[PDB]
Amino acid sequence: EKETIKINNIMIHKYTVLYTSNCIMDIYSEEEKITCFSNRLVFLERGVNISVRMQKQILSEKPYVAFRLNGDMLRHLKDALMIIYGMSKIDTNACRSMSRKIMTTEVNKTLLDELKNINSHDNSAFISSLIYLISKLENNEKIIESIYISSVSFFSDKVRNLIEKDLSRKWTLGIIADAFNASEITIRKRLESENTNFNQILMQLRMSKAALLLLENSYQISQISNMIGISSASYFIRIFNKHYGVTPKQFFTYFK
């Protein structure tokens, strides 16, 4: 009688738009809380780390519908949104708040129709539809801010881009210190000003790739483990359970 699940330590690596087709989910980012009811839209700003508690309505269907944007697209939308609207200058990368990174609204019939006939194959049509949707929302300022913030490239993003070219290699701080011509102290203090370290980034990348590949339903567990750079399958199951809080079979069964 488990139509509920708790998941820990999820990263949003792409600006994400979510629609609750059938679930109710509470979100604990750090030490706050935002709950999302049945029929709503959610805007998730790129680079937040959050934990979730979900309850489904119907078991024979999946909990939600998701739209994600890559970097080219995100930049385009930022550009055209700059042209159509104004330009703000809270450009100081200082104070954050969870309530400026997560947002929910109540979906209408007219928004729902356009949401229906969205097919993420025609790129320009997709950009048009998102701008149309944003225009119909009240207090949309908070969204445009979050779309600009997530368009700038930090040093951690360069480290990530470097790592993604060979995920099954065995990286160390010394090797990263070679590609960027600097010292280990320089690189570790640079990543320390953004409140992270090298092991954290490597772990988040590998567990993101694994969670995504599990849902394709076209590779054994050993194939996934060899793809992300891990010796044995049983070791991989231990680490997945310790990071996310559930087993790969439970994850797959819930989200199908």
Q: Which residues are annotated as a binding site for decanoate?
A: 13, 68
Neighbours of 136 (CB within 10 A): 12
Binder of residue 65, out of a copy of itself, ligand DKA, none (CB less than 5 to 8 A by kind): none
How far is Cα 21 from Cα 58, in angstroms, rounded to an integer? 10
Cα torsion 145, 148, 153, 155 to 10°: value is -10
Structure tokens at 120: 């993420």
What does the binding site for a copy of itself look like in residue numbers (CB under 8 A)?
A: 76, 79-80, 83-85, 110, 113, 124-125, 127-129, 131-132, 134-135
Binding mask 22-61 for ligand DKA (x = CB under 6 A): ----------------------------------------
Minimum distance, C-beta of residue 17 to ligand DKA, in the bound complex (Å): 11
Find the binder of ligand DKA among 8, 9, 11, 24 (CB under 6 A): 11
Residues at the annotated binding site? 13, 68
Q: Is residue 251 classed exposed, middle or buried when 0-12, 13-18 and 19+ CB atoms within 10 A define those classes?
A: buried
Q: Which of 23, 74, 89 is nearest to 44 (CA)?
A: 74
Residue 12 within binding range of ligand DKA, rule CB under 6 A: yes
Binder of residue 155, out of a copy of itself, ligand DKA, none (CB less than 5 to 8 A by kind): none
